[PDB]
Design a protein around this ligand. Sequence first.
Ligand SMILES: CC(C)CCC[C@@H](C)CCC[C@@H](C)CCC[C@@H](C)CCOC[C@@H](CO[C@@H]1O[C@H](CO)[C@@H](O)[C@H](O)[C@H]1O[C@H]1O[C@H](CO[C@@H]2O[C@H](CO)[C@H](O)[C@H](O)[C@H]2O)[C@@H](O)[C@H](O)[C@@H]1O)OCC[C@H](C)CCC[C@H](C)CCC[C@H](C)CCCC(C)C
Ligand SMILES: CC(C)CCC[C@@H](C)CCC[C@@H](C)CCC[C@@H](C)CCOC[C@@H](CO[C@@H]1O[C@H](CO)[C@@H](O)[C@H](O)[C@H]1O[C@H]1O[C@H](CO[C@@H]2O[C@H](CO)[C@H](O)[C@H](O)[C@H]2O)[C@@H](O)[C@H](O)[C@@H]1O)OCC[C@H](C)CCC[C@H](C)CCC[C@H](C)CCCC(C)C
Ligand SMILES: CC(C)CCC[C@@H](C)CCC[C@@H](C)CCC[C@@H](C)CCOC[C@@H](CO[C@@H]1O[C@H](CO)[C@@H](O)[C@H](O)[C@H]1O[C@H]1O[C@H](CO[C@@H]2O[C@H](CO)[C@H](O)[C@H](O)[C@H]2O)[C@@H](O)[C@H](O)[C@@H]1O)OCC[C@H](C)CCC[C@H](C)CCC[C@H](C)CCCC(C)C
Ligand SMILES: CC(C)CCC[C@@H](C)CCC[C@@H](C)CCC[C@@H](C)CCOC[C@@H](COP(=O)([O-])OC[C@H](O)COP(=O)([O-])O)OCC[C@H](C)CCC[C@H](C)CCC[C@H](C)CCCC(C)C
Ligand SMILES: CC(C)CCC[C@@H](C)CCC[C@@H](C)CCC[C@@H](C)CCOC[C@@H](COP(=O)([O-])OC[C@H](O)COP(=O)([O-])O)OCC[C@H](C)CCC[C@H](C)CCC[C@H](C)CCCC(C)C
Ligand SMILES: *C\C=C(C)/C=C/C=C(C)/C=C/C1=C(C)CCCC1(C)C
Ligand SMILES: *C\C=C(C)/C=C/C=C(C)/C=C/C1=C(C)CCCC1(C)C
Ligand SMILES: *C\C=C(C)/C=C/C=C(C)/C=C/C1=C(C)CCCC1(C)C
Lengths: 227, 227, 227
Amino acid sequence: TGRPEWIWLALGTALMGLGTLYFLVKGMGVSDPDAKKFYAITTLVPAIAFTMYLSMLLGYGLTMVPFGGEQNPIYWARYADWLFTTPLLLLDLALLVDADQGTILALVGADGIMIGTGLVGALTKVYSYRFVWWAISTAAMLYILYVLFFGFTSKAESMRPEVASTFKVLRNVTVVLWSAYPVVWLIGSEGAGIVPLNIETLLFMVLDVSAKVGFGLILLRSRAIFG
Amino acid sequence: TGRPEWIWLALGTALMGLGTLYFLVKGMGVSDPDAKKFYAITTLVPAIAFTMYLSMLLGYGLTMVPFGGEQNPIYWARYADWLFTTPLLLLDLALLVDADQGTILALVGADGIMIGTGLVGALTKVYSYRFVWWAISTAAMLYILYVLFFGFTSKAESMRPEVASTFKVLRNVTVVLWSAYPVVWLIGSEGAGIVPLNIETLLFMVLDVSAKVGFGLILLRSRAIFG
Amino acid sequence: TGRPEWIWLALGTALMGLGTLYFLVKGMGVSDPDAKKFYAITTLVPAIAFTMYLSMLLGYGLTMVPFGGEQNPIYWARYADWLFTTPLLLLDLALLVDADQGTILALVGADGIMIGTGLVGALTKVYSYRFVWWAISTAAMLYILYVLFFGFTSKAESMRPEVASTFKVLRNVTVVLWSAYPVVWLIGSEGAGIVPLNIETLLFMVLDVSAKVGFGLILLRSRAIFG
Ligand SMILES: CC(C)CCC[C@@H](C)CCC[C@@H](C)CCC[C@@H](C)CCOC[C@@H](CO[C@@H]1O[C@H](CO)[C@@H](O)[C@H](O)[C@H]1O[C@H]1O[C@H](CO[C@@H]2O[C@H](CO)[C@H](O)[C@H](O)[C@H]2O)[C@@H](O)[C@H](O)[C@@H]1O)OCC[C@H](C)CCC[C@H](C)CCC[C@H](C)CCCC(C)C
Ligand SMILES: CC(C)CCC[C@@H](C)CCC[C@@H](C)CCC[C@@H](C)CCOC[C@@H](CO[C@@H]1O[C@H](CO)[C@@H](O)[C@H](O)[C@H]1O[C@H]1O[C@H](CO[C@@H]2O[C@H](CO)[C@H](O)[C@H](O)[C@H]2O)[C@@H](O)[C@H](O)[C@@H]1O)OCC[C@H](C)CCC[C@H](C)CCC[C@H](C)CCCC(C)C
Ligand SMILES: CC(C)CCC[C@@H](C)CCC[C@@H](C)CCC[C@@H](C)CCOC[C@@H](CO[C@@H]1O[C@H](CO)[C@@H](O)[C@H](O)[C@H]1O[C@H]1O[C@H](CO[C@@H]2O[C@H](CO)[C@H](O)[C@H](O)[C@H]2O)[C@@H](O)[C@H](O)[C@@H]1O)OCC[C@H](C)CCC[C@H](C)CCC[C@H](C)CCCC(C)C
Ligand SMILES: CC(C)CCC[C@@H](C)CCC[C@@H](C)CCC[C@@H](C)CCOC[C@@H](COP(=O)([O-])OC[C@H](O)COP(=O)([O-])O)OCC[C@H](C)CCC[C@H](C)CCC[C@H](C)CCCC(C)C
Ligand SMILES: CC(C)CCC[C@@H](C)CCC[C@@H](C)CCC[C@@H](C)CCOC[C@@H](COP(=O)([O-])OC[C@H](O)COP(=O)([O-])O)OCC[C@H](C)CCC[C@H](C)CCC[C@H](C)CCCC(C)C
Ligand SMILES: *C\C=C(C)/C=C/C=C(C)/C=C/C1=C(C)CCCC1(C)C
Ligand SMILES: *C\C=C(C)/C=C/C=C(C)/C=C/C1=C(C)CCCC1(C)C
Ligand SMILES: *C\C=C(C)/C=C/C=C(C)/C=C/C1=C(C)CCCC1(C)C
């Protein structure tokens, strides 16, 4: 239920919160117009994650969903967080590699579908169907990781070595991180109950902090963001 | 009620789904930077339509609304679909004719109002009021079709003949299609019950497929999208 | 409750409505590409405010929220209105002063957080918590007003005198207006009950009309919008 995992929600709230604080301070004296955007996109991610986590901790981001034949606690705020967060992360990778507009809109359009479809599946009352959505959602993710891995990498090979290499790191980091979500979702209480909500929450917590603080850290402390 | 029309929802789900598949494959080997955006915008439309239709078919996109003095099944997913879909269609017409930013924001701003206001009217419990919203919504649509017909046409006359002519086709096609919605809505169960939900669903189904697959077809198979 | 203040909702609906009408007509014969965007952004604000107010008047934008130990009428449509409105107002100030993209995304990202967080607090059932959100929301606002006052002003000093001065006016006007919201919210039925809903509604009404009609008036009637 929504009680014993409060500690993961509390610890995550704190980390995202501190995560925002640091980026804000770190980006204080940046004049480079390029880096400026990077700081904006990257700082906005943990900030949002902060408010969504706090809402899960205080209770607002938790709802109840019946399926299988029981009342299941679903943290919808997770999706609300991701819905705005993932596009930004994507935007970072794109600026860095200088992606085309068509491809950005495609990636972003695909991303909303991944989360929207994911949320839908989390709120679907027919236990069976929940897995269709998971499927459609995961497909969208693969499309995104495909374009990021091959599409972007190829695009980064024309950038100066600092960029090509920083991106590479971020590339591997996102590919590994992003794919853990559909797996965590699948084994957690939202899907095939194989791991308790308490663990599910902890797993997503580590994943969210890594994706919104780690990623930012790796990027914002690189020279790559300077034009 | 929400049962006998399942077949229109199923057939539509299939068409949008196939609609996405084809565009994805067709845009596979496109290198032209212009066409690329076109494929992105146009492919994203049926994809979204796919997920929204599937949700109506599985039951998620259906809700119940009391008014007149009864429980009325309202497919809110239709609006959710249109909310993201219409801006994109508009974006296509704009890129094609090279519209100004002010006019795009205006058209898009007007579009959200058309759908938002339409949805509101679909969820309004006071039977009487439902028609005010329909009115406000239809006004917004007219504003859009006005700008598209005169504003854009004039803008397309400066483009190469392929563009001016392709646009023209799309222009007539959207003007005719878009205006059928406020009429279908008005005579269907969501408004003045003159046609059963079963027909209403079928009518919107034909309209959605034409607007998201036909339009894409006409455009994506034209030379117009190449810079 | 949601009845005696209907007059403020009615009067506001009317003003926003007339507000849109005037801007539409005033921007009819504008050819300047710069001014065009300004008219678009500025006209779209009262239009949205119109639909949201009308929804509060008709009843749709009102909901009930228990907290403190009672049923409290909460006009969520206020937040829905602001959510789309404030970014636009911000966009106006930015175009006028020629702000960077990083700073716009930052301001807009901060703005959504201010409203999103504000709405959350308005729907939070735990009376106590409602004030945390108010706090987080108000912080975001200060961040925005900070950047607008110092950041933008500095940016406007490089524009021609008409712009620098018009902006200045708008600058003082928004700083004074925006900060009245968190105060009105705090003393109204949504926070520390010190003023009845009837007054709260009237206060926000004056504030919304000033922000969406006054601001537009001051700006749209200035030469500043011409490139
Ligand atoms: C700028 C754009 C153009 C912005 C877009 C903003 C918006 C559309 C995004 C929201 C995202 C959506 C996708 C997620 C929503 C999920 C939704 C399906 C689930 C609904 O719940 C959330 C919603 C409703 O709350 C409710 O208010 C109603 C009206 O008063 C009530 O009727 C509902 O019942 C109420 O729901 C709550 O309470 C339920 C409680 O039940 C109780 O539980 C207790 C437990 O102890 C006990 O059991 C009681 O007995 C029992 O009754 C609970 O179960 C429900 O779950 C729920 O809590 O809330 C509003 C969501 C808010 C808008 C999201 C915050 C968003 C953040 C702050 C925005 C920052 C983003 C900016 C925009 C990005 C900037 C950068 C860009 C450039 C990318
Ligand atoms: C990127 C942006 C910044 C993105 C914006 C995303 C978001 C804000 C868009 C959503 C759009 C809005 C406008 C439409 C919402 C309509 C809303 C008013 C209606 C609410 O329903 C939908 C919502 C809630 O579902 C629910 O979960 C709650 C929490 O757990 C519950 O409390 C609710 O009750 C529950 O509602 C469901 O179940 C009801 C069931 O009742 C039962 O019915 C059965 C029938 O047999 C039987 O009778 C039972 O007895 C009875 O109890 C049902 O009646 C309700 O209708 C409902 O099903 O769901 C969330 C919506 C989801 C977010 C929309 C999918 C969006 C897609 C995938 C996004 C793709 C878009 C991208 C963003 C675009 C990219 C391109 C751009 C560049 C343009
Ligand atoms: C383009 C983008 C990518 C666009 C984004 C659009 C979208 C996501 C934005 C919405 C914004 C969100 C943030 C606000 C939502 C607040 C939400 C938490 C609160 C929920 O209520 C609103 C929602 C649901 O209505 C409902 O339908 C459900 C399904 O059928 C029902 O299950 C719900 O119960 C029902 O809720 C209503 O009714 C309740 C009634 O109870 C009754 O009250 C009477 C009183 O006499 C009596 O007591 C009865 O006994 C009692 O039962 C009531 O209490 C509830 O409050 C509610 O009324 O409605 C949908 C919202 C709609 C989408 C917002 C309008 C938006 C406008 C028109 C859009 C214009 C914006 C464009 C996009 C901007 C363009 C420019 C850009 C460039 C910046
Ligand atoms: C519990 C808490 C931990 C959680 C926090 C609560 C949180 C929810 C509320 C905060 C809002 C937050 C969400 C918003 C974050 C936005 C973030 C994305 C911003 C990234 O930042 C990008 C830039 C925006 O661009 P700029 O103004 O154009 O830069 C000017 C530069 O000098 C170039 O000038 P040139 O062009 O002429 O050459 O920030 C502008 C740079 C400015 C010069 C510096 C601004 C000063 C700041 C006000 C101070 C930094 C903040 C401090 C850590 C204090 C924290 C208080 C906070 C809560 C307001
Ligand atoms: C039930 C089903 C029917 C429904 C489908 C399920 C669906 C919900 C999930 C899929 C996600 C979908 C919503 C997302 C669609 C996005 C769409 C808008 C994309 C449009 O496409 C635009 C471009 C993006 O731009 P680019 O990468 O920059 O192009 C590189 C070019 O070579 C130029 O290089 P240069 O600049 O150096 O000169 O697609 C990039 C071009 C790439 C080179 C080609 C990419 C290969 C693709 C992975 C293969 C195409 C897909 C296949 C049909 C397989 C379908 C599987 C799908 C489910 C993932
Ligand atoms: C906080 C930041 C990130 C990087 C969040 C990423 C989230 C995902 C990649 C989620 C993926 C999902 C899939 C593929 C299918 C089931 C539902 C999920 C939303 C968990
Ligand atoms: C799927 C694509 C398109 C082109 C959808 C278009 C939808 C409309 C033009 C809807 C118009 C409406 C009006 C004008 C008023 C009543 C409600 C509607 C939303 C149906
Ligand atoms: C209609 C236009 C404007 C300018 C609306 C502005 C709204 C705000 C500045 C609201 C601020 C809030 C804060 C800071 C905290 C409590 C909740 C509010 C949303 C009222």
